[PDB]
């Protein structure tokens, strides 16, 4: 199995979740000023959005 890795270690990196984004206020996120995205968030009623 050590032989199988080698490459896997050389390239290890994680990811994120939109929930993990909403929880973190340290990371800053935004959208296009005038777009369907901003309007969809503005008109939304879901908890995360």
């Amino acid at each position: 199995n050590l032989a199988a890795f080698l490459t896997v270690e050389r390239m290890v990196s994680p990811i994120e979740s939109a929930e993990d984004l909403s929880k973190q206020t340290e990371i800053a996120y935004g959208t296009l000023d005038s777009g369907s995205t901003k309007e969809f968030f503005r008109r939304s009623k879901i908890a995360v959005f």
């Binding site: 199995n1 199988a4 969809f40 008109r43 009623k45």
Partner: protein, 88 residues
């Protein structure tokens, strides 16, 4: 019973669409109703309720992949103790 599976991907992409006869008074409002539900997220809630809510269906090695060798080892230690006590 989960006796079947999906293979590969989608040959074509399409969508289910409400229908009405030509010139219907319902056609104009149903479009606005669909868009409002899409924005509110209602369709996704219905999808989750009727699809996900009905759900009945390198990396290291794990004790499971090798547990058999552990079973043999302990069994052997036991057999050895038995043989020794028998001889004693």
């Amino acid at each position: 019973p989960c006796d079947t599976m999906k293979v590969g991907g989608n040959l074509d992409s399409k969508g289910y669409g409400i229908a009405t006869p030509k010139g219907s008074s319902l056609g104009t409002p149903v479009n606005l109703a669909v868009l409002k539900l899409s924005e509110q997220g209602v369709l996704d809630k219905l999808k989750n309720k009727w699809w996900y809510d009905k759900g009945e269906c390198t990396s290291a090695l794990s004790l499971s992949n090798v547990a058999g060798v552990f079973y043999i080892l302990v069994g052997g230690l036991g057999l050895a103790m038995l043989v020794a006590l028998i001889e004693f």
